């Protein structure tokens, strides 16, 4: 049992862009989409945006310290701001005893993920089964989770912690779906201060012996 990082989804190139010295194959009308590009003999894949002009215009290609294209001067007279298409990280939350699983999607906001992820591509042939329940993706402080039920429970410890306070509680005694619980802080015995020449003393009335092995 544990939380294992697995292979991530990759954005699928929606269109293409070409340039030189029809009409739908242009940088404009494609801003925000991961596209292939071949601009004046420099080719790759990325996402274009509208950024304020920077660098030297006559040298249309704008690089960074590590020889990565980060900008481009188009024939239309606009400076286009260039990125790389980004992957969606994936991890699997697995309980061995009940043989149950959920999917944690890195740090994504559940707007970019769907039950099929047809917009993305990865080597893995299919997604986890995610049976009849199949409710909408749950949004957690650690990211978007598929196959978790909001439980609003508290635990003193868990075997699979998701992150930041979060645990996946398996439906242990057909086992149900895993639940999203949180680790609660165990408050020490509170003793209040007096406002006098007395003080409050907390003292045991019973005891036991305990062996710590090391």
């Amino acid at each position: 049992s544990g939380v294992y990082s697995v292979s991530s989804f990759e954005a699928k190139p929606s269109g293409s862009v070409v340039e030189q010295a029809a009409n739908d194959t242009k940088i404009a009308s494609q801003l925000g989409n991961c596209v292939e590009y071949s601009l004046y003999g420099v080719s790759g894949r990325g996402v274009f945006q509208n950024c304020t002009a920077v660098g030297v215009r006559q040298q249309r290609f704008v690089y960074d310290a590590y020889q990565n294209l980060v900008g481009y001067y188009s024939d239309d007279g606009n400076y286009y701001c260039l990125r790389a298409c980004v992957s969606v990280p994936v991890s699997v939350i697995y309980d061995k005893e009940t043989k149950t699983h959920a999917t944690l999607f890195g740090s994504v906001a559940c707007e970019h993920i769907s039950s099929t992820m047809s917009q993305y591509s990865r080597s893995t042939r299919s997604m986890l089964k995610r049976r009849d329940s199949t409710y909408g993706p749950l949004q957690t402080p650690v990211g978007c989770v598929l196959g978790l039920v909001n439980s609003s429970l508290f635990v003193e410890d868990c075997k699979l912690p998701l992150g930041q306070s979060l645990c996946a509680l398996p439906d242990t005694p057909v086992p149900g779906e895993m639940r999203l619980a949180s680790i609660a802080f165990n408050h020490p015995i509170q003793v209040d201060q007096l406002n006098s020449s007395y003080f409050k003393l907390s003292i045991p009335t019973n005891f036991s012996f305990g062996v710590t092995q090391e």
């Binding site: 960074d64 980004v86 650690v142």
Partner: protein, 333 residues
């Protein structure tokens, strides 16, 4: 500053080596269980980090404590240790003065979708490109602050007599005067100079706010730990531009320029280079984690010796004669 953890990093070995190109996947498939060894080593290191955090904070928690009300301390102004209704003021200042990149942990993938222009090699947006990932820490900021604040509320009442199994809820001033009486200052002197002692303690504690600067060695150590984390990530992000004796560093470029007999050779050069990089990264992470575990044990000893009791051995807690020690959370310790 005592470091207790390192940043938890997992890499997607398949996507780091081949970044999506189906031709490279087949070439790497006959390399067998290298990527699997990298993944298992990283998973074990992260599990050990979680276990270290749990052990340290299970040894830090007190069994009994006093609620931290405003004005806790009385004549001694330690309001910079009190939580602002959950971190302390000095803890917030320490976290503010440290140059640390904000990881996403939530909708951080969509933060890098817009991303503006890149902010000087953003290692937080590079994970969704290079193929690694930074895991969130086991506990929240609020839970860590709860542990530290519960530790602060038991400092005075640690017990003058065999104080392990009993808690006396005495004021902070009484505890300070008992600690001062035990280092060779008589009751008469303490009774005459009550206000002077309180003022002198406040002067020393107040000079802390204007202390986080270049001359502060502990603050420099905090920044060094953050920079070590950043360098570890940057070395991974930097080897993707390397061309290990090939015609290009992009797999998609050599694919659309040569023929399969040459494609295989070039792609194999790149594959071997990237696998060597990943192996070196894994070894360095193992070394850093093994060092951080010993440092966490040292922090446990210091919490048990200086914070929960007044130490009689010189030099261990601080300089001079030790009286009282406070502890807050820091970026990695």
């Amino acid at each position: 500053y005592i470091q207790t953890t390192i940043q938890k990093v997992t890499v997607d070995c398949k996507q780091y080596v081949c970044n999506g190109f189906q031709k490279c996947e087949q070439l790497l498939r006959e390399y067998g269980q290298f990527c699997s060894k990298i993944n298992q080593a990283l998973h074990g290191a992260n599990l050990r980090q979680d276990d270290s955090v749990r052990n340290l904070f299970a040894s830090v928690k007190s069994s009994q404590s006093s609620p931290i009300i405003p004005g806790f301390g009385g004549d001694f102004n330690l309001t910079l240790l009190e939580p602002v209704s959950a971190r302390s003021a000095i803890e917030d200042l320490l976290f503010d003065k440290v140059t640390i990149a904000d990881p996403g942990y939530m909708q951080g993938y969509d933060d890098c979708m817009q991303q503006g222009p890149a902010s000087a090699r953003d290692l937080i947006c590079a994970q969704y490109v290079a193929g690694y990932k930074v895991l969130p820490p086991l506990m929240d900021v609020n839970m860590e602050a709860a542990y530290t604040s519960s530790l602060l509320g038991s400092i005075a009442g640690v017990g003058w007599t065999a104080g392990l199994s009993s808690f006396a809820a005495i004021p902070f001033a009484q505890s300070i005067f008992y600690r001062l009486n035990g280092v060779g200052i008589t009751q008469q002197v303490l009774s005459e100079n009550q206000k002077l002692i309180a003022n002198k303690f406040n002067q020393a504690l107040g000079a802390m706010q204007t202390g986080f600067t270049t001359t502060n060695e502990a603050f420099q150590k905090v920044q060094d730990a953050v920079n070590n984390n950043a360098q570890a990530l940057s070395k991974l992000a930097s080897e993707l531009s390397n061309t290990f004796g090939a015609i290009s560093a992009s797999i998609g470029d050599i694919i659309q320029r040569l023929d399969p007999p040459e494609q295989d050779a070039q792609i194999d050069r790149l594959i071997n280079g990237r696998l060597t990089t990943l192996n070196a990264f894994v070894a360095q992470q193992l070394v850093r984690s093994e060092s951080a575990a010993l440092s966490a044990q040292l922090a446990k000893d210091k919490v048990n010796e200086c914070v929960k009791a007044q130490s009689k051995r010189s030099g261990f807690c601080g300089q001079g004669t030790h009286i009282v020690s406070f502890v807050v959370n820091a970026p990695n310790g």
